[PDB]
């Protein structure tokens, strides 16, 4: 994990991407990742409350409450958010992908998307699961019944299938 | 420890990998995982913003690794407009050979003693097969071989020499030195 | 802790400014990557000035060693190789691959051409690549190389000189 | 934690870790076990110091239980390759390859502090192990001026020598309490 | 995490970690176990301080359970080699090699705080272990002014001395609550 | 080391001797291995006599729910009266087994502690199991299911007297009558 | 410690050996080559004692190694004997395949068991194994390949009643008739 | 992995055997799990014991193995050829690598698989030595399958399993059985 | 799990083989294996000082002094010793194979034999010289040939080992 | 796994059979556990006969000095002649035990190696133990303390012939006479 430095002032390359309003959600989501992503989103809003923010997602998912913290922050800030699926968006990753601004949810052609979810009481685990159903229903425009049925299936969707389902808007090979 | 080198601009000190990045060289050395993919993708996108026309060099010495991470790099290579020169040094196996093959036509290179493997050295069963079919389609597109030939070749647990890989359509040039 | 010398450089970076590249310890992909980056950087600083490669290595990963070997042949520069301590397995291949006339050992070094999850056929193909490379740089026949590599032993610098692995055994400069 | 010190130069004030400051005084430390990593660092320092001046003495401080023989021999060969006088100093102990480096200092310039201990005993195929051992015998014979027979016999004994005994043996020249 | 402090210099402000700042005041810390790495660092600091001034006192703070005997002896020999007066201070404890270093301070300049504890008891081949032990007896005899017989008997007892008892024994000179 | 005892002569390890007196021990955490052993013992004792009572000694913090349910189903499958005894504690699945003894034959010693709370696969499946537990506790305690669900949310133990009033057990005994 | 029991001359058996004597074979726990070897040896031994008498297979398993499960399955089909399968606790993955492979009419579950047909080398070989499972489930459940494939994609358990309706088992029993 | 005990009626009364020892009394030898020197030693000891009990009666070898150490597999193979007895081999679950070699080395006509087994002839010191061992395997497979060395070499390069029917056609086994006839 | 066989007396299968005068040297040789092999050889000599003993060898070698302890015991007892190489005999394993009674050293057809060998330096060389002397005695090759051959990191086939003088017969089945 | 042998019938593990022949093995490192066992065997053999020789087989790198001294003292305490045999090696405390056999009855096989060199307590106590070893070697070898001290400093092995000349053993035997 040596991070290359680029000259524009010298920045590590992730800090340079942040200057272009790009936030990376790569790898598992936990409280530490959520904290960082939230800090970046709030910083970018203060730099400009109108300019779009790009969120790059390559994630197998992770901790549900951490994912929900990022989701709530995405909705709290005013900015348009362009989400991009590269590699995969599974579990909480696909929720974040779906939560991008309508018209601005993107996937590359070979990505895979999973809405399936591969110590607390049983009732609390179900309450969290219902929160996920409600969020997916809101952003995909599918019924709760369809979301519940689809999330039970242990499978990935192609980008085209995810587009038809309402998780994303555009499948792009290159810019138009 | 990464050595530091000085470039004349006054003088600026770079670690040697950052200096290579300044020359439009991106390294894909070692196993491919999400962390490596993230770094390679960031570098490719940065280089495109510096110039959407100038070639980018991708050095590949890799046993492969995580398929979805490899596909993320592959999709980024196709997304950016730039010519990409791929170079096989040491080995390109599994996802490494896919990236090698995905360089711009005419600009896929190997050094003379490298070894290339398209075999994948041994989620639900159906999903594993879907990924495998995606690999077949990508190799078919860039090698110009049929799906039948690719499927048969990938079943064989072997490496190809650079000349063999050239004949197969994985690369274009086997170079001892510059022309 | 790496000492700093005086612009302030860590001592390995200072050696690199003097066109010295170190191949100390086991060779793996990470070492190969670093050595290759240094060789290519030094070529861009000057495609004519000699590069010094210091080798103290028990060997390591064959494909990583071959990546360094191919880079040594790719760049135009004269490469002076130096054996200090030992050059075994892939280390001795790199030593032998220096520019003719510029392959050196210190007097107490030891050199080994013996090699102390892939298919049997692929292991043999790699071994044959090593035979061909040693034959080319030592000027010995394939038969002699194959026989010598079977023997689990080190050569002294003088014996390695007679074999064609190196050119000069030096106590001090002339 | 390595303390940082400030030195006054021709270009102003510069901050060095204390080992880097010692290197500026032409002092090279060989403390702890000798392996390829230590040899690499010591060799780089010796070659750097030669380039700063091929005439000025270099001080080598040795407190070592020994270590890897080929790594020790790499340092030894570098000591002989550079032109500079090398003052060796035994502090604490010089055992196995450490005592070889101590003995390899420039004649007249091999030193020990009074309470140091020196060991020439040494605490791949059989033939190759013997070849290395014979190389050590030859090097000790050359620098101590003792016969091969005496060196071989002495190296078999699992013991340390005092600085005075090491002086009489030809490993070092001076046992010093303070400067003259 | 080591706090940073700011000093005013000829060029403006310089930031030192607090141990480096103490070194600028000629204070060398010997806290924790003594091994070759600690000895190397302490020796480098003592030699640096001698080069800054061969007359100004050096303060050595000792809070140590002891450690490696040859490493302790390397520090001891360096303390005797440099010309400078050395004030030793026992804070917390000085046990085994720690108490040897404490006792080796310049006569009149060996100090303890009131609640410290001092141990001269000490918590390779048999002959070599005894030779080292005899070196310790000789050093304690020299600096405490007690006979070899008394030192040998005292070192057999698995116990600590109070600062007052250590003063009476000849290990230290002053037990201080605050400056005079 | 398990001591050996002699019966009038045959030598048994002491647990095997207890088994001869129709005593089955459920001590420690419940997992598939414990369930297998307990089930084998219950079925063996039924074959020796389908009428004679079986004593089940329970000192358990609970454990794997499906393993506990396997024991529970076996207790209901065999015809025999089963006397359950709480010694030390019966928590989580342990208290379910205690409650599942034959009515009138569920016992605790005076200093035992009983917990019906479950100290904290897909979410839906975790809830299905939890609902199965509610139904079983309701059946054997004779409390409405609404009361069971509320009580199981409370992270606490009951004394033997409180567990008796709740319908988990029938008798709190210091010694035999 | 495995308790020892006495059978009537008196002979002392460990309790699992006593069960084997009653023609009961336990498949409790993860299935791997070692478990398969033991189960196969027991089935073949029981066939040699009598090629007509029923054999009882008790299943409490989360599944395990597919080829090991298939070795047991093939042995069940090879021997002539009627095989009564019993689900206690759970039968998941390969466990539910063995349950379903009992003799028609003789596949049983206790009331609180859970059954899963979902399944929690090169890609082509993994798919070939998966297709073998589809074919076996189709044969014993009498469902179509399409229905089996769809059902196996769903990460869920079935109740015993739902498994009965699906064709995995024949009887859900609280006690003997 | 507690091994059940079974009781047999003898001339002197009752004898208790662990179930594997009981199978050995019926001339059944198990090769289950990875093959290493320890497994080879036990299998070899059992084959030689069974030969001494009768040099004519068939021996059954049950194979469920991913393979393992090549020299250990070859030790078992050589023992199978050394004893005079007919050896019936049975593939249950899988026979991969050295496991499939042992399966193929059963007496002609007596090599069996159950219907859902999988067979692999692919194989998932100095380089020259590794090749010498590999050539020994080619020669053994050629002898027992009756295929050419060229066909064996090509087939062993492919990282795949064969079904029992495909293994039958290849010459690795003779019969694929659901139940006895 | 070691199977038990009945002869009534019940023996584990290795103990049954010992009743047939078979001693197994399978796996690495260390002091514990040497102790067991030596005890078995001495026991078999006491049962009969004339009847042959069979030693089965499948070993990568191991501790030199432990191997030499077995070797010395083989020479001490009067009995003919038939050695059998199954799988491999490498390093000390091949020394034991070669030390069988002349005419009674056997290999199965697919075994591999290695005489190459994959404290202070002087003591390591003394042990190595002891091995040279023992191989020279039992193979009838010169010290020079043994030293040269042991330097080569390779295995011999049974036929090559026969020609070298390590063994006498390569057998597919009994005659 | 220790093989079992039959004597004319009683079945012994092979080490117990050797003990029946008055053979005690000291193979492997010497620690308190090994000492305890050897001492028990020596005392048992003395009670069977206080006159018949005992054979001690030594293949040992040495080990704990006080444990070795416990065995040594027991060898001297019992009346019996003790034949010591070096097979493989006798190093450190192993060579002390070898040397402590009855005069005329200390044996080595031809390829054995013997080392008298010794490859938390206070320094003084370590020296006291070392002096005890010097005294014991002097007594049994008949060499002076000065010669023993000098020889023990040398990190080397002796051949059986050299050990014979030194006074550690009496006979180097290829086979019985
Ligand atoms: O201070 C600000 N906004 C101004 C600002 C300016 C520069 C930066 Br950097 C960060 C925030 N806010 C940011 C919003 N925050 C609430 C919050 C917190 C949070 F974790 C998530 C949210 F969506 C929202 C309360 C305080
Ligand atoms: O904003 C830009 N490009 C401009 C730019 C300028 C400087 C830098 Br540094 C990085 C990007 N894009 C780059 C393309 N990106 C989508 C994307 C994301 C991705 F992960 C892979 C892709 F191939 C493409 C969306 C945002
Ligand atoms: O960009 C350059 N050369 C110019 C240059 C200038 C400054 C630096 Br720093 C590095 C390279 N090349 C360097 C050679 N590279 C191919 C290559 C790659 C490689 F890994 C090994 C090789 F021997 C050769 C293709 C691109
Ligand atoms: O370049 C130089 N000398 C000049 C120089 C200037 C500044 C520095 Br920093 C280092 C060396 N040499 C130094 C000697 N080196 C060979 C060598 C290498 C080595 F590892 C040990 C040696 F004793 C000698 C070849 C190159
Ligand atoms: O070079 C010097 N002294 C001058 C000097 C000036 C600045 C610094 Br920083 C260090 C030393 N000496 C320092 C003493 N050293 C011998 C030595 C070494 C040692 F490890 C301990 C000692 F007590 C003494 C020999 C070289
Ligand atoms: O074999 C018998 N009963 C007779 C018997 C006699 C001696 C013994 Br020991 C065990 C059982 N049954 C017992 C009931 N069993 C089904 C069963 C299995 C099970 F795991 C739990 C149950 F509650 C019931 C089927 C076969
Ligand atoms: O020997 C027999 N049957 C007789 C018998 C008698 C007592 C016992 Br115990 C075991 C077997 N057969 C049984 C079937 N076996 C092949 C076999 C092996 C196998 F692993 C699974 C099978 F379904 C079938 C071949 C040998
Ligand atoms: O002693 C016998 N045969 C008789 C016999 C009788 C009962 C038993 Br149990 C074992 C062997 N032989 C058996 C064959 N053996 C050599 C051998 C050893 C071996 F490991 C594999 C082989 F194929 C052959 C030599 C001694
Ligand atoms: O007591 C006997 N022989 C008779 C005998 C009888 C039954 C048994 Br069991 C063991 C030995 N000897 C056996 C040989 N032993 C010396 C010995 C020991 C040894 F470890 C290896 C040897 F080659 C020889 C001396 C005592
Ligand atoms: O009771 C006896 N001897 C009689 C006896 C009879 C049968 C047996 Br078995 C063991 C001892 N003694 C044996 C000697 N023992 C003292 C002893 C103990 C010891 F550990 C070592 C010794 F050298 C001596 C005191 C008790
Ligand atoms: Mg103490
Ligand atoms: Mg709680
Ligand atoms: Mg799942
Ligand atoms: Mg493979």
Author numbering:
A (entry chain J): 57 to 64, 71 to 180, 192 to 249
B (entry chain I): 58 to 66, 69 to 181, 193 to 249
C (entry chain H): 58 to 63, 71 to 180, 192 to 249
D (entry chain N), E (entry chain M): 58 to 180, 193 to 249
F (entry chain F): 58 to 65, 70 to 181, 193 to 249
G (entry chain G): 58 to 65, 69 to 180, 193 to 249
H (entry chain A): 57 to 180, 193 to 249
I (entry chain B): 58 to 64, 70 to 180, 193 to 249
Could you give the paper's own sentences about this structure?
The mitochondrial caseinolytic protease P (HsClpP), a serine protease in the matrix, is responsible for the homeostasis of mitochondria proteome by degrading misfolded and damaged proteins under the physiological regulation of the AAA+ ATPase chaperone ClpX2,3. HsClpP is highly expressed in multiple tumor tissues and has been reported to be oncogenic in several types of cancers. In this study, we develop a potent activator ZK53 that is highly selective on HsClpP but inactive toward bacterial ClpP proteins.
HsClpP assembles into a tetradecameric state with fourteen ZK53 molecules binding in the fourteen hydrophobic pockets, far from the active sites. The interaction of ZK53 and HsClpP is strongly stabilized by a π-π stacking effect between the 3,5-difluorobenzyl motif in ZK53 and the side chain of W146 in HsClpP. Extensive hydrophobic effects are observed between ZK53 with the adjacent residues of V148 and L170, and those between the 4-bromobenzyl motif in the ligand and the alkyl chains of I84, L79, and E82 in protein. Additionally, the N-atom connected to the difluorobenzyl group forms a hydrogen bond with the side chain of Y118. Likewise, another N-atom that is connected to the 4-bromobenzyl fragment interacts with Q107 via a water-mediated hydrogen bond. The crystal structure of the ZK53/HsClpP complex reveals that the W146 residue is essential for the selective binding of ZK53 with HsClpP via a π-π stacking effect, whereas the corresponding I91 in SaClpP unlikely provides a similar effect, thus weakening the binding of ZK53 to SaClpP. The activation of W146I HsClpP by ZK11 and ZK53 was substantially weakened as evidenced by the increased EC50 from 1.6 to 42.4 μM for ZK11 and from 1.4 to 11.8 μM for ZK53, while activation of I91W SaClpP was significantly enhanced with the decreased EC50 values from over 80 to 8.4 μM for ZK11 and from 44.5 to 5.4 μM for ZK53. Indeed, the ΔTm of W146I HsClpP dramatically decreased in the presence of ZK11 and ZK53 compared to that of HsClpP, while the ΔTm of I91W SaClpP increased compared to that of SaClpP.
